[PDB]
Design a binder for this molecule. Structure first.
Ligand SMILES: O=C(O)c1cccc(C#Cc2ccccc2)c1-n1cccc1
Lengths: 141, 134
């Protein structure tokens, strides 16, 4: 496998290679004729830097997907203090979303991310992922 | 002190008044939501502020940006990270049944206004395993 100068690669490149290896196990549909964005993977936690690396590596590994920027999650029960109404207050936990054209590929990618981060030290192993579904799709521009 | 956000909240409340479905569960888990996008950045912001006031039981992301979809023609397709000028936010909810009601209310609310407000789009979404908001 390719090795960068001095015997190392950037974290996002190694993520891409790990994802490629896991995804090669699954020959599931990634696109449809209609090309609608009906499924997704919602990825959060860890730390901002770990999600940054994961997001960059996901894009490198999967041309068939589309990604949001990194953003932040609100709180669950009992939000922290702030001048805005509770529903708007931002935690320090970050997230990003992956949009996909098939529900099965979302499942495969969710499982790949879970398997990959379990091999990394904290905080990367604390990244969480769930598949999501969009009833009417998302009409990406 | 914020008449614009309060007016949006009042309009949403009037539409939501027609339903009495449960907005919370004993489990308390964030399993459904609405994904709101388009319009303009400012119109989405204003809706987000009004939603927070009308629905204390929801949680909201900040505004963010959508990537591009498919490009017509033989290529090139956009890279997965490319960002468009179209914004979105997510509403997290404890029940799918109320997600459906909120989707209908947002659609009915924004169609009463001129562009760009009326170009706001909304779809129900679901999270297979929930989202463990902190
Ligand atoms: O600021 C925006 O663009 C905007 C975004 C979303 C919703 C509204 C509204 C409304 C509404 C409020 C009361 C009754 C009927 C409709 C909105 N808005 C408010 C004034 C002009 C536009």
């Amino acid at each position: 496998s390719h090795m960068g100068q001095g015997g190392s690669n950037p974290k996002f490149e190694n993520i891409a290679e790990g994802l490629r290896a896991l995804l090669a196990r699954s020959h599931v549909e990634r696109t449809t004729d209609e090309g609608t964005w009906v499924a997704g993977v919602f990825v959060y936690g860890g730390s901002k830097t770990s999600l940054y690396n994961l997001r960059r590596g996901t894009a490198l590994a999967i041309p068939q997907c589309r990604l949001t920027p990194l953003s932040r999650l609100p709180f669950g029960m009992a939000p922290g203090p702030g001048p805005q109404p509770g529903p708007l207050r931002e935690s320090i936990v970050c997230y990003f979303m992956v949009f996909l054209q098939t529900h099965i590929f979302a499942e495969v990618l969710k499982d790949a991310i879970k398997d990959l981060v379990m091999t990394k030290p904290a905080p990367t192993c604390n990244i969480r992922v769930t598949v999501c579904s969009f009833d009417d799709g998302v009409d990406l521009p």
